[PDB]
A = this chain, B = another copy of it.
C-alpha cells in the first residue's frame, strides 16, 4: 500500500478567496503526501487583499468530505484540488481519506485541544517580516464536513496590501 498525493498543483493560478472578498485574490500551494502513519504537508501562500481589512489576523478554511474532496464552502476553489499525476491534478479523488487528519488523534469540532494544532511561522518577501501561522486539524469545520484544515495567519501588525510567503512544512497523523 502506497498512498496517493493530494495537492493544488505545482504552480497554480489564483485559487483562494479570503473572508469578505468577492473573487479569488490569492494562490495557495498545498500538498499532502504520506508514509507509514505520517502525512507531510508543504505550504506557501501569496495574496493581495483588494481591501485594507481592519484586522491583524486573516484566515482560510478547508473542509473535506469522506473521500478527501474539498467542499464548496471552503476558501479554496474546488477546481484547484486533486490527485498528483506527474505535474497535473486528477479531479475525481479516490482514497483521499488517507491524507486527512486522524479522527481519533484530532477529534472533530474540539477546539480546546492544543494537541490538535500546529504552530509554525513563514517569512515574507519584504524585510525579514515574519507571519505566524496556526494550523487546525479537524478543529474548525461545518456540519457537512468530514475532515478539516484551518489556516490562520497573524501579522506583526496590520496585514500588507500584498504578500507572498516562503515554503513551510508540517507533519500530522493520517486517518486509517
Contact = CB atoms under 8 A, between A and B. Distances in A.
A173 B6 CA distance: 12
A48 interface: no
Number of copies: 3
B31 A167 contact: no
Interface string A67-108: 000000000000000001011000000000000001011010
B35 A164 contact: no
Contacts of A2: 1-2, 36
B166 A118 contact: yes
Interface stretch (A17-25, A50-58, A109-117): A109-117
Interface residues of A, number: 53
A38 B44 contact: no
A124 interface: yes
Contact of A31 (B3, B38, B40, B41): B38
Contacts of A44: 114-115
Nearest to A5: B36
Interface in A1-47: 1-5, 7, 10-11, 29, 31-38, 40-42, 44, 46
Given A31-B37, A38-B40, A172 B167 contact: yes
Contact of A46 (B34, B114, B128): B114
B169 A170 contact: yes
Most buried by B among A29, A40, A84, A172: A40
